[PDB]
Predict the structure.
Amino acid sequence: GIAQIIAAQEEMLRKERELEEARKKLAQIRQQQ
Amino acid sequence: GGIAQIIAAQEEMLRKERELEEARKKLAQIRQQQ
Protein backbone atom coordinates (compact mmCIF):
# COMPACT_ATOMS: atom_id res chain seq x y z
CA GLY A 1 0.00 0.00 0.00
CA ILE A 2 1.29 3.41 1.13
CA ALA A 3 4.67 1.96 2.21
CA GLN A 4 5.22 0.81 -1.40
CA ILE A 5 4.36 4.33 -2.64
CA ILE A 6 6.71 5.87 -0.07
CA ALA A 7 9.60 3.55 -1.08
CA ALA A 8 8.92 4.32 -4.76
CA GLN A 9 8.91 8.05 -3.97
CA GLU A 10 12.17 7.70 -2.02
CA GLU A 11 13.80 6.02 -5.06
CA MET A 12 12.65 8.83 -7.36
CA LEU A 13 14.08 11.42 -4.99
CA ARG A 14 17.41 9.53 -4.97
CA LYS A 15 17.43 9.46 -8.79
CA GLU A 16 16.59 13.17 -8.96
CA ARG A 17 19.58 13.93 -6.75
CA GLU A 18 21.86 11.62 -8.74
CA LEU A 19 20.71 13.22 -12.02
CA GLU A 20 21.34 16.69 -10.57
CA GLU A 21 24.85 15.68 -9.48
CA ALA A 22 25.49 14.25 -13.00
CA ARG A 23 24.15 17.52 -14.47
CA LYS A 24 26.46 19.60 -12.25
CA LYS A 25 29.51 17.46 -13.08
CA LEU A 26 28.92 18.00 -16.83
CA ALA A 27 28.54 21.78 -16.29
CA GLN A 28 31.80 21.85 -14.32
CA ILE A 29 33.67 20.09 -17.15
CA ARG A 30 32.15 22.46 -19.73
CA GLN A 31 33.49 25.36 -17.61
CA GLN A 32 36.90 23.75 -16.95
CA GLN A 33 37.62 24.17 -20.69
CA GLY B 1 40.76 14.06 -24.20
CA GLY B 2 38.72 17.12 -23.29
CA ILE B 3 35.96 15.91 -25.61
CA ALA B 4 36.16 12.49 -23.90
CA GLN B 5 35.49 13.95 -20.41
CA ILE B 6 32.48 15.73 -21.87
CA ILE B 7 31.17 12.60 -23.61
CA ALA B 8 31.71 10.44 -20.48
CA ALA B 9 29.89 13.03 -18.35
CA GLN B 10 27.09 13.27 -20.92
CA GLU B 11 26.71 9.47 -20.95
CA GLU B 12 26.40 9.42 -17.14
CA MET B 13 23.72 12.15 -17.30
CA LEU B 14 21.82 10.10 -19.90
CA ARG B 15 22.02 7.03 -17.69
CA LYS B 16 20.65 9.07 -14.72
CA GLU B 17 17.81 10.44 -16.86
CA ARG B 18 16.88 6.88 -17.82
CA GLU B 19 17.08 5.67 -14.20
CA LEU B 20 14.91 8.63 -13.11
CA GLU B 21 12.33 7.91 -15.84
CA GLU B 22 12.25 4.24 -14.70
CA ALA B 23 11.72 5.41 -11.07
CA ARG B 24 8.97 7.75 -12.29
CA LYS B 25 7.37 4.82 -14.19
CA LYS B 26 7.44 2.54 -11.11
CA LEU B 27 5.69 5.22 -8.97
CA ALA B 28 2.91 5.71 -11.56
CA GLN B 29 2.62 1.92 -11.88
CA ILE B 30 1.95 1.42 -8.15
CA ARG B 31 -0.44 4.41 -8.09
CA GLN B 32 -2.22 2.68 -11.03
CA GLN B 33 -2.51 -0.50 -8.95
CA GLN B 34 -4.47 1.69 -6.51
